[PDB]
Amino acid sequence: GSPLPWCPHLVAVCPIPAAGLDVTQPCGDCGTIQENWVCLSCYQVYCGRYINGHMLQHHGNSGHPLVLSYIDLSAWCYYCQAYVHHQALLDVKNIAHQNKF
Numbered sequence: 001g002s003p004l005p006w007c008p009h010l011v012a013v014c015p016i017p018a019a020g021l022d023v024t025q026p027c028g029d030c031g032t033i034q035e036n037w038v039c040l041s042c043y044q045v046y047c048g049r050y051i052n053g054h055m056l057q058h059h060g061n062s063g064h065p066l067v068l069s070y071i072d073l074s075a076w077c078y079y080c081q082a083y084v085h086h087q088a089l090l091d092v093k094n095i096a097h098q099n100k101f
């Protein structure tokens with residue numbers, strides 16, 4: 001198995017844009033449609049580590065901790081190096097779910 005039930009970076013999760021989420025939004029750097037994530041601090045979208053690693057780059061240059069997968073709606077913390085699930089993430093996950101499915 002399960003994600004962590006809490007992490008010390010949940011405090012950095014910011015309010016969801018009224019625009020909502022677009023789970024088909026491409027990577028802001030390379031334009032790939034594959035394995036994208038959305039940053040739960042600034043809501044920029046960048047690709048996963050198995051494509052071009054742009055979300056990892058975003059974490060490195062911003063320090064933003066938590067990102068949500070447009071594949072499976074899991075949330076990853078780059079500081080804790082673990083998946084995290086908590087009530088503080090349910091609204092953003094559900095918005096993504098509604099857009100995706």
Ligand SMILES: O=C(O)CCc1nc2ccccc2nc1OCc1ccccn1
Nearest residue numbers: 047048049050055056069071072074076
């Ligand atoms: O891709 C990112 O930038 C962050 C998420 C993530 N981090 C990793 C770090 C080291 C090894 C494998 C990883 N695999 C990762 O995500 C895999 C994945 C892909 C799709 C849905 C859920 N999880």
Ligand SMILES: [Zn+2]
Nearest residue numbers: 027030047054
């Ligand atoms: Zn990319």
Ligand SMILES: [Zn+2]
Nearest residue numbers: 039041042064
């Ligand atoms: Zn960010």
Ligand SMILES: [Zn+2]
Nearest residue numbers: 007009077080
């Ligand atoms: Zn964390």
